[PDB]
Structures are given as C-alpha cells and as structure tokens.
C-alpha cells in the first residue's frame, strides 16, 4: 500500500510501481453490474477533511479508505504493512487516534508514517537540508537531519499564495480595473502563473518597468488586457518577501529560517547549509532562488557558504519518498506493530521514555 | 599516553586520548570490532576510566586463543579452561585487596584518591585539578541520599591559562538581566514556571466592545490589574524574579518602579537544578508563594569574567546542592580534554 | 577478508606528522611577518561577496581567512583567545608560536620525548611569569591626571603599529577624556559610534552627549523648533499611532451613533495621550516605537520635537546620558522621570541630519562621530580605537605596562638563557631554544624597518647583560633606545597572557601522535 | 542499499557504468588469438619444402589450389623484377618520362648536383635501394640540364611522381640533412610515400 | 614533506605581495587618473557613458561618472568612493581631486623605484598637505556678503559654471540661485536644507527658461476639470484625512439589527458629508490641501460650493505647501479654524500647451520659505545635467554662507601652493625633500592638465605664468581661463570656493597615504 | 597623456572604453547613419519608409515624420 493522502489527493499503487494506479478526485465497470458504482459515487461525494495541515474529521477518512482499496486496489491489508501520509504537523493525539481506528477496523500487522517534508527530501535524493514548505494556506519550516523531523524545530508562517493574490487585487484597485470576482480571481492567478518573476528587488524593477518601460508585456488574452507595465507581475513576489506590503508588518521568512537554523548546533547547520532545498505550493517562478540566496547571504557570514536547490517538478514527490522508504530495507526496524500495539496501546507512541 | 586528533565525517575535530571517546569517534565495520567496542562502552558506563585496558586484555586473550586453536585444540575444552582461570581470578583478586578508602571526606584524602585516575589523563600537573575536583565534590557530600553527576555543573570560558580557574558553589548561565539594577545581596527569589505575560487562556478569548467607555477603561484597567498582580508578587519581599516563559514589558516597567531584579532562563534543566540548589518551587501561577516553597540565596550578581558576561547564583555559605566549575582555556579542545578528565575523576569518586 | 573501518580514512604517523605539523604553523606566521611594530603594514583580502578588508592585527584577518587544519585551527583559536583576553599583539603571539615550533625542529628530528619537552615549557613559562610580576612597572603616583597621562601614552602605543600613528595624541586624549568621563563599571555597550563619510581624522569628533541618525520622518517635519536652550526629554517605550486596540476587540453594535462615538473615542485616547505628553512640560519626545503622523502634526502645533521607532541602543544610551528614565505608559509621567538637557538641535554635518544634545550634567557616556575618506579606512579606525579602549580598560585597574619596541623579548630571552645555565640535560637545550624563539621578535620588527639587526642585536645583548631595561629599537631612525623613556607602553597583562597561552599551545601541539580522516558523508 | 534503490528509481548518481568497456576489450583480446593459427598454412610458401614437420594429411584439393595461387603470385611478382641500377637520362628527353613513364608504376625522380657528401650519400642509398626493389623506376641526372639555372641551394630534392601528379615531396637537405642518415630511414620515407610496404623501428 | 592543504582550497587561491603589488596599484591608478583627465575645473569637456540598463548620462560631475561604472579593480572602487565623498562635501573638483591623487601616486611610483619605504612617502605627503592647506588659508580673501549685494556671488556662480554646459546663459542661473538661497536660508543657524527646494525639470523649452519660482509647484489638476481654473490671493487649509466618514483603525463589525438602523446609517452618511462641507465652508479658506483623495460627492459639493481643493497630494509636497503658506497642519475638522489657515498669493493652472500634463503653481504675495526651481531644455540628458549642475551650485552657495569661503582658482592656487611647498621643502634635511618635491610636482600637475584641456601650448604657458607670479607675488595671475589674454586674475576673477580645494587636498593626501600601505594582496 | 588599457584589466566582462578619435568615429558613424536614415525623407517632396517589428505579429505602421521611427528602432 503506497496510498498517500497528499495535500488534497490520495494515490494508490504499490511500492514497486512507478506510479499509483488510481487517483482521488475527492463508467469503467459501471455498466456491467453497478455494484461498485454506488460505493465509488458515494465515496466521491465525501469531501477532503484536511485543511491547513491538521486533520479535521475522522469518520469520512476511514469511510473513504475502506472503499478506495477494497473495491479497486483489491488488497487485503491484514497481510500487508501500511504506509500512508499525514498532515504536515499534528500533536501525538491525532497519531494515536488514527492508530486506534486503523487497528480496530483493519488489524494490519505493522505501520509507519512520516511528515511530507521528509518524503519530499527523499524524493529529491537527500537525507539532509531544510526545505521551505510553502504549502497552500500556510507555510512551514522543517529542518531535516538524517531523516527525522525535529519536534523542537518546526516553524509555521501564515503566508499563502492566496494571500499574495488577494494583496495584488488590493493594489489592483490602484491599477484602475480591479479584480475581485471568481473569474477575476482566476485571471489574476492565471497572470500570476504566467509572469510574476523576480529580477533583484522592488524599486529597481519598478524603475526599469516605468522609467524605460522595457519590462512591459502586453496581455493579449480573451480574459486579460494590457494593464500591466511590468509592475503587477513583480508586485506578486514582493509581498512574498517583504511583509509590510500586506499590512501585517513582521519579520521576513528568511528571518524565521535563519533562527530555526541558528538555534541548533552550528556544526549540523553545515549539513543544513549543504543542500537547503526548497519546495513549492506558493512559488513556481524563477528569480526566487538567487534572490533569497543573496537576501539570506546578508544574514549569512561571508566565512561560510550557502547553496540553493529547487527542482522544477515536485508533484508526486511525497509519493516518490514513500516508494523509496518502502524499499529502504531498514525501516522495518522502526515499524510499530501488533507486538507493541496490543502490549502498550498508544503509550509507546507517546515516548514514555526520555 | 598521547592524544589522537581525529576528524569525524561531521567535520568536528576530536582531539581525544580517551579510548572510550576515541571509539565513540571511531567508525568501524568489522562485527567483532563492534562487539569489542560495545563491550568497552558498557565497561565505561559501569566504571569509566581506562577503557583501553579492556581492549588490550581482549586482544591478548584473542591472540592466545588463535595460537592455541592453531596448535590443534577444540573449542569447548579451552573454553572451560579460560572460564576456570576466570573464576580462579574471581576468587583470588579479592584476596589481593590491599587497602580501603576511608570516610571519603578529608579533602587531601579524596584528592590523592582521585589523582590516580586523573594521572592517566594529562600528566603535567594533576594535583591542581585534584584540588579543584576535591573542593567541588566534597562540598556536596550526600549523607543518606545518593551522589549524582548532575549535582555538578561545568562552565567553560575561553580565555587565559587554566591556572586562572576555580569552582563555584551554585550555578552560572550565559544570560544578561533585563533589570535596571544589577547587584543584590541576600535577594529573595520567586521562581516561576508560568509564562510571565498576562496569563493567556487556552481557548480563543475575544474582547467585545460595545460602548466608548469600554475602550476608554480597557488599557487602564488592564495595566492596573497587571500592577496589582506584580504588587502582590512584590509584597513577598522578593528581590529577584525568575521565569522561563514569554515575558511582558509592562511587568519589567513595574519592576523598575519597585527596583526588582528580573532574570529569564531558557532550559528546564536550569529551572530544575536551580530549585534543587535553592529549595524554591516551580510555581504554575504568578501568585506570590509562601516562605516555605521559595529559595533563598546569599548574593546574586551579573559578574564579568573576562570580557564575557554571565548571570551568577552564588551562595556565600557555599552549601547549596549543585556546584559548577569556571574554566579558562585558549581552545575548545583543551576544554573537552580537561572536561573528560574531570569526568573520569568524578566517576572514580 | 573485510576491512576494519569505513573507506576513506587516512593514517600517517610518527616524526613525519610531527614535522609536518610544525611546518604548517610556520607558513601562517610568514604571511603576517611585517605588521606589528610602530612601522606597521597593511594587507588586503577580497572574498566571496567581494568585501575587501584591511588590518594589521592578525586576529581579524585570520578570522576573515578560512582554513581547515588542526594545527591551523589551533593557531586561530589561540589567537582569538589572546584577542578576547586583552587584545593587541595577536600578530606577535602567532609569531611567537611559530618561533617556538621552528626553534624546536631538531629535537623533533633528534631523540627526545614530549614529556621532557612539555615540562621544560611549563617550567620556563612559570619562571617567565614570576619574573614579569617581580619586575612589573609601578608608577608610585596614584593620581588621576598622571593616570590619564599614562593612558594617553599607552593609547599612542596602541595606535603605534596602527594606521593613525600621526594622530595618536589627538585620538589618545579623545579616548582618555571619553573613558575618564565614564564610571568604573567597565560596561562596553554605551560608547557606540556614528560613522560619517567625508572629512579627515581631526574632523572626527567625540560627542559628550548623544548624537544619533535622524531616522525617517513623516510629512510636516522640520516645522518644530530647531533650538532649545533648556528642553526636556520624554523617552518612550510606547507607540503613538491610530491603530487597532488588541486585534481581538470586535465591535458588534447596531446604532451608527455609537459607531461614531467609538471612532471619536479612539481619537479621544489619541488626543488624551497627546495632552498627557503636553502637560509634562517637555519638548523632546523620542520612541523605540512608530509614531503616527497626527502626533507630529500636533507637536508642530504644540511646537516641539518628535522621533519614533528608534533602535533600543539609542534610547538606552540617551537614558544613561540625560539622566532621565524610560517610560512605558503615558499615565505616570513625573517632573523627574523625564529627561533634561542644556541644548538640543538638529544639525547638518557632511550630508546628513543628526540630533544633538549637549551640556548635560550627567556626563556618563559618549558617542563618536567619525569623519573619514574610506570605508576601509573608517572601519580600520573603529577597530583600532576599540583596541585602545580595551587597553585603557585593562590598564585603569592596574599599571601593568610594558614598553614597546619589542625589547621585552630581549629581557625575556636574557632571563631565560641566564637561567638556562645550571639546568642539565636537554632541559637546558629546550630552554635555550625557547629563549631564541623569543629573541627573534624585534629582529622581525626591525628588519621590516629596513636595516641590519645583527649588530644591534649584539648591542642589545651587551646593554641587557648588566641591567638594561626595555632599550628597544628606534623605528624611523633605525637605532636603539629605551621605550620606557620613548613612552610607547603596552599592557603587561598582554604579554603574560601571550606567553602563557603560547606555552599552552606549544605543549598541546607537541602532544599528538596520529590522525584519522573520515569519509565526510 | 539506498544507492541501489535510487538506481532502480532514479539515475541521479552514476556508479554502474563503464563496466562493459574492459569486458569488450578482453573479449576481443581473446578473439584475436586465433589469427596465428588461422593462416599458418596460408602464409609460408616453403611449407612443401617443410615436409616431415608440416604434414599431417593432404586433401590435395585446397592445398594444390594453394600451390596454384602461390605459383600465380610468384610469377606475377617475379615478372616485374627489371630494375636495380639508377640511370642517367638527359634533359632533352625529360618531357617524355615526366609524362610517358607508365601508369601504375612509381617513379622516384631524383635530382642532384654531385659533389656534396649529402647528395653523394643520398645517391649511394638510392642506388643500394635499387638492389632491393627492382620494381621501382629510379631517375638521376643534373638538375641544371633538367631545370635551367636551377638554384643549387635546393639539392638534393626528392621527387615522387606518377601520371604527372606529385604525390610526395622531399625538398632540399632540410629533410635529409646529416651524414647520420641511413639506408633504412630512406626506405622508410619512400614507404611513407605509399610506394613500399615494410616495417622499421623509427 | 609533500605539499599539503593548509589553507582551505589553495587550488583557486591567488596571492600577490611585495613591490609587484605596488606596481599593480600604481599602474591601475595612473590608468584611472589619466582616464579622468579631460574635464578639469573651469574649462573642459564632458564624457558620455551608458550603464547596464542602457541609459545615456553625460557630465563633468566626475562622481556620477565614476559611480555608474562596473569597474573591476578595488582601488578604482575606492576612487569612486572618494569621488562621492568630495561631491557630497562640496561638488566641484569631482575630477580635480582624483587627478591630483593620480599625480601624487605618479610621484610615489617614481620615488618607489628609487628604493625607499612607503612610510617616508606618506609622511612627506602629509607634511606637504599641511603646508599647502596652511598657505591656502593664508591666501584666501574674505568676501563680505550681505542680503542686498549679490554681484560677487553672481560672478562666483558664473565662474563655477565654467566647463559645465549651463554656462550657455551663464548669467540668470547665478541670480536665481542666489535669490533662492536667500529666500530659503536659515541665517541664524547658517543652515540650508535642500529638501526645502523641489528641483524640477521638464524637457522642451530653452535654457533661457531656467527660472526660480518664489513658491511651490504641484503636479495635480482639478478634481472637477470643469471647475474654474485660476484663483488670485486665497486662503488654504491642509487636512491630513480624506472626506470619507470616520472609520476606526480597529477591526469593526457594525451590526444592523433593524431596517430603521439601515435608514439611520444611510441618513448619517450624507449628514456627515454635508456636515464636513459646512465645517470647511465656515472657516472661509479658499483651498483645501489633502493627501489621500476622497469621494466624488465632495467634488460635486465643492462644485456647488466653488471652493477649490486637490487630492492624493504626496507627503513631502504637502509639507512644502504647508511651509510656504505659513499656516499649520490640521488633522481633522476639530482642529479646523480660521486662524491656522494659510494665505495664498495666487494659484494658477498650466498644461504646457502641447503637452497633456497639468501642473499648478503657488506664488506667494507674503513671505515664503520653500522655493521651486524649474528647468526647460533639450532632453532628459539636458534636464538631468541642469539639475545636477544647479544642485552643485546650491552646495557651493551653502558653503559660501560664510565669509572667506572663496580664493582665486582656475589653477592659480595650484601654482601658489606648489611654490610655497617648494620654498618650505628646500629648507629641510634629506630623506624628506624628495617626497615634498614630489607633492609640489603633483601640485603643478593641475595647471598642466588645465592648459592641455584648453588646448594651449602647455609647458611654455606654465613657465611664463610661473615667472610672472614669482617675480611679483599675487594670488591672481593664473593661466587663461577665458583664453583671451589677461592672465591677471584680478580681471577675469575666477571666484571659487576655499574649502573645496582644501578638502580636495586633504582627501587626496589621506587617500594616497592609505593606498601606499597595502603591500600584500590576496584574491581567490 | 591618454592611456587606460595597457596596465591591467580595470574592467569586468563586457566593459570597455575608447579615448582617441575612435570614440569620435563611432559617434559620428552613428550620427550619419541617423541622418541618412532620416535625410532620405525630409522636404515637402520628402519620402516615406516602413517600420517593421521583429516577430510578434510584425507591427506595421506607415509614417513619414521620423519621430516614431526613432522611437521604434533600437539605437545603440
């Protein structure tokens, strides 16, 4: 079972597969008998119970899980160890609650799950390096050393690409034709996914887009118009970096990353200095990498060096990490199985020791 | 002995002559080597000093084993041979016990007793480290409880030669107070475990304002209630305030109004050991405690120790419950080596 | 079979390593073999972001340098230990270390054991410290003005082997008047410096009061009076701006009259704070927190100053200067909590506007206005004056001073070799090598000055064989003279720490047997 | 472990490559060992004179065929041995041998002025070469009567002609300078012209 | 021993040390100084250059040229920094000081090949700068400038505009600059902040149009374009808040629990609007000066109220309007009264005819404090050139606020200081005369490059002028700046600053003393 | 004196300079190019040209006066 409840999707294949066989959209056999038609359409009706990186409902998840691999994946999990994903951060309460339902309705032999950041780091082929988890709705910092995520080192910041688009449309009223409707929100996001790059900085980009006006790109779109002088494009990333644009004046994300690295011992930061890979969710355009590189280089001592890593595609990265860990051939040493579930319940999960 | 500079795959330069520390640094992939190194590890756990003795003994035993089994012996008979010799040693070694340490209390007594284990370490002069370690250990001599290694702390400070080092009965920390006053003697200590701001309820609490007067009196009543709480705390006669949670500035200003020392720590270990050495308590609320559950200290300072500033808790009676050692060295690795030597001495004691 | 350890190790041992250690150290020293000494030389290193840096005290450069070797890192750490302990001469301490290692090469190649070697260092250093303390310099004055005079002489010494040796008297009296104006608490946060482009060294000035950079100001500024022969200062840790109350105070009213009442009442709070400030009778309102435009408009109507979101260091220096007290709420202002000054004005100085306070009775802090022609030059000056401050703070406790010119090494070597006569065995050999390593230093100084040392070194031996003290080397005259009468004085604690840490590092380095590389996963 | 799992999934590290090169090289090294015995009976033309140490069986079909091909080869090669003395034709006829010299026959057109040990030794070497290769047309003469007032500082210049096309050039002593120059080196150069197939160390 | 990695990554590690490093320094610095030669002082040319983004900018304001270069060597960046320092100090000699530094290091490289420690050269340069500045202060003449006499200042600015294309008109700019300085100066404090002057320029027009306006210029048109366009003397008010109903800066949720609440709010909205109208109409001020814009209801009401106003006016321009009008700042109608209002001299609307820009000027009948300078010319290059030139002129006048801020320039000061340096140096022992003579030579470098730039036969020119000014001593015999004979500068009267040349000398001496010391180098 | 290239590389990549008549030649070649580009159209019997963009629908506009002509072209 390489099922992985992603940000909004669940993808079911096997560890050895190159990809999951089925998707989770939240009439193949539906004209022969119709037995699974009702079950799958009912499961389809149920919604995604995960928001902002924390579980919010529990009955529906098991409701969906039952069907999703009892009617198309055709697998008995009693004869299988289990490997799912989870929301980026939760206290032990959700973990030990999910263990109860999993065992009491499936009684599967063993289990192990990990934070999505670890899966992404494995997919990129790293066991080290902090990744900027710029997820939807909210972003987080997860410095990974050797694979395990530090419970004392996770920082959470409320920035979102939705917020960037909203702030753009908060300064698109100053552009004349504002944009607020569903179609207008969609076209703002479309233009953002077309061009909101970073060259170096706000004022110097605006000068070269207004004094010489050589950064203009005419929008010949059925849903768009030539209303950008090169300002609004670059006006999306700026609030991504400088908080006071949005009106919530606080420290920069770079500050949060720098502190989350400095609080640890300097030596291990070297390894964190090594890769320092990134992740999407709110960032898709270049100019991010070198800009944040130099921006944190201002915060980084000249005696030490820093690296920036960003793969172009990270869509099944958690799935790749899961598939790799399923074949790591040492993760079974950390399986939590019936031998401990029926012995101690959820207490060992709580780490009664230390 | 001779020090063995080793560099780990994490690029930390370990200048180690401690065979236990050496093996901790060593990365070996021979399973029998893993057997032997873990054996030495548990040995150091039980005793601590001279882990290399076990190594050399096992090596000599194994080479003799290779010799005898190359002669043509079988496994069993010679196994019982070693075992009989071992139990013979088991019984005969106690007969060789020559003397027994007495009273573990006279300072030169314990100094000479521990300088033996220290002498396996740095050779230039152990008697100085012997004096320091004896002064530290004897001061905290348990009567009916149990001596613990956590009852002794360590304070390394980069600086001049090791000769300009001493011991301190109390604790030292790398912090600077937010209090406008610095030096208090016979201060009254009110340890707090709760966050120092206005106690924030665990559920979302929302202010609901309807009329103007609600806004008008809001800040005034808030600061007055804060002043009431801080005044009630001040009424116990406290001269310092200790807390670990998030701090609020209004409290600092009020403390200035009352000339109150404020200190914020950062480690739960620190709070626990401070309560152990002063007898105070971890108060879950800001409410003033009673005289019984507080800690009393002879003098507290922010004393400068060589162009490095530290908060110091010193008891002039020098009784306390935990003592730490000030260390002055030109390099960190010298600190590490002396620290492990002191570890050997304290395990000896 | 199967290999013991992980692949990627390295194992070189024996005399090979020992020699291979010493040599490395030597390299570093010859890189900086010309800096210290009142001649003085300057380097230049550009790395990474292209930031150039210039210095003649080696600790800074070596920190800018990035090096990976146990011997090299040990040298870096002992140099930083000397730096943080007292200060200047870090060049000299690294040179002395390399001189130790170079002096004892043959013993490493010959038959000798590290035990005898290290005990020789320990005995020699013990005796050197005893000699230093026994013939230390005492003035028998115990007077404030003579204290300041000696401080000025030692400050000129600190600026010797630095870049501003011409202005040594000027900056020396400047920093002495700075420090003697301070208390005996040795706090070093309170003497911050505000650096300025343009102007020469004599144009740089020390402010008795407080000068800080006038930060960004909103519209309506400069309407306030720019001169007050007796203003009053109101330091604030409170924010003045029309904002949200606590981010959770939700309105749920249904009558628009109450709505307008709430708005007007928020304005009432604003104007209440304004009136409370106004009744204080003060004219200078500063703040670490943002100040709204309406506040400055009111102040212009009320004809008084304004400044906000200033860094905390600035307000704390101001609090220590004016003798006032920082407030947090506007509800508790008194006639003595506020700050008081004798003259306050904003001035234009070489292309910027600063806020100035002077005449305060509470003279307990100062700030430097530096006028320079080069950022490299400016930061070299700031670090040199910081060194002078450190020297002064060490010396005011006690006049543990040593004359300049490097003759001190001649007294040290004279005493060592004179002592190195009765001791038998290779102990005497090691003490003689230890003495020659010391002997090298002023030859290092003077050959950089461009003239022979051999004859003057023999003259030094002759002069010191019968009781000559600190008859050091002349610098721009290439001769010999007593630096105690030439009035270039360095602290003795410097050299005591130097030789103690040098013995430390020497015995440490002599005391290794092998090394093991690891794969660096 | 992890690296090989990477290998199944990705190719981000390379470590399983280039292990086919030495494999194929060793395969060819073992393959090329049968060429010694493949043509053992196909090279020597004295094996008939090597009776009682070369005979195991005679099939008389391919082996008499080998005699037939061998004798055809021998008659073809010995019908061409007509030379061996470098000859001195005159400049009057010169046009008739620069062009009418036979197609398919190499012509070593030597030009020289006698008197210098350079030219004398070169003439000696080519005359001795004529004793070995009587299938090569040698020409020697005085360049003055071959080319009018030819620069005497440009001798001895070796010419290699066939069908009026210059194939190889060796102009002046700038490529033959030195009494140390020898028999085999001249033969080597003329082989390098493409006329002769032999072997030499250098 | 086999070589081993001591320094981290010695593979990409490049070291230079010794005399060769000084050779590299001197060669690069001589190349730069000779690069920056042909713009000297009162008469020269202008160097044109384009930067990374493709912008054409040409001037003899040397600091800009050096700043806009993507140079490679460090010493050149140091030169750029020195140029910026001198420009922000005075604003003239932006190339004079760098050419002087180049001359000093020419002398340094000559004496270096003679085998002497650089400390000697630095000491000689420092002593020579001491002597030169001391005599330069002895020779400058005090200028008695009052509030009614301007001719010496007019000639000062006129001479200052030499080699700067703005010398086309060469006369009116001096007058308008002096008038602006007088209007805006804070006499008692001796202070003039240039943030009080809105240095503006618009392409087109002519350099004759270079004017000073004794008031403020604003670049926003009517909120009601149909409203009457111009008003004579008026009364203004400055409101820092829009015309929207007062909503607090705290998140507010106003419930509406009844339909009569809806009626109450829709009535209170207008009631507030016309209440604001009545408030502002009562005070009698003709004009309203706001910052954040407002709603069209206010526009039509003022159309029915005939009371002019503007909106979205920026911060600094708001402040300047307030400064010029003499009033105070009114945050809200509570502070609104007839007292704090500001009286207007006259206000009018222009559009520059063919252009579609709109721009309001405020010219005051009563006393003003903030003036405005406008420019008309050939292109943005012309506009920026005039802006920077006049700005440097304002810096010159601000320096000239005091007396004795002028000495005869045009190169004559260079001859005088060189003569004094030689005279003092000759009566000295050895080991110093060489460096001091080197400084002297660096001093007469300036007149040599001056004569070169003018195209005059150099060496004979300097020889004859030196003989003339040696045989009879005066500070006014410099070489021809107007190139028409009459080298007696008591006729041409090159009238330029004292502290400018003194600061150039000090900066050059300190900078060469600094560069002399960097003898060991390290690059990656 | 005029020399700014022989001693050392005082320029980064793509940075150059020209002091002597070379600079004048470059400027005048550009100016004469402008003139012939424009003098072929002046007068009441002046002539006309066509301005064509590089790609992107090939913006076509006919014009006689040289203003828009000098606006569109990339002058160097």
Residue numbers in the entry:
A (entry chain S): 8 to 33, 48 to 375
B (entry chain P): 51 to 399
C (entry chain O): 5 to 525
D (entry chain Q): 9 to 210
E (entry chain M): 13 to 536
F (entry chain J): 2 to 77
Task: Copy text from the publication.
TRiC-mediated protein folding depends on an ATP-driven conformational cycle, which regulates the opening and closing of a built-in lid over the central chamber of each ring.
Briefly, human PFD-bound actin remains in a high protease K sensitive unstructured state. Further classification revealed clear actin and PhLP2A density each occupying two opposite chambers. In the closed TRiC chamber, we identified completely folded actin which indicates overall that unstructured actin was transferred from PFD to TRiC and then subsequently folded by TRiC and PhLP2A upon ATP hydrolysis. Notably, both PhLP2A and actin interact with the positively charged wall hemisphere comprised of residues in CCT 3/6/8. However, the presence of substrate caused a dramatic change in the NTD H2 to cross the inter-chamber cavity and stretch towards actin.
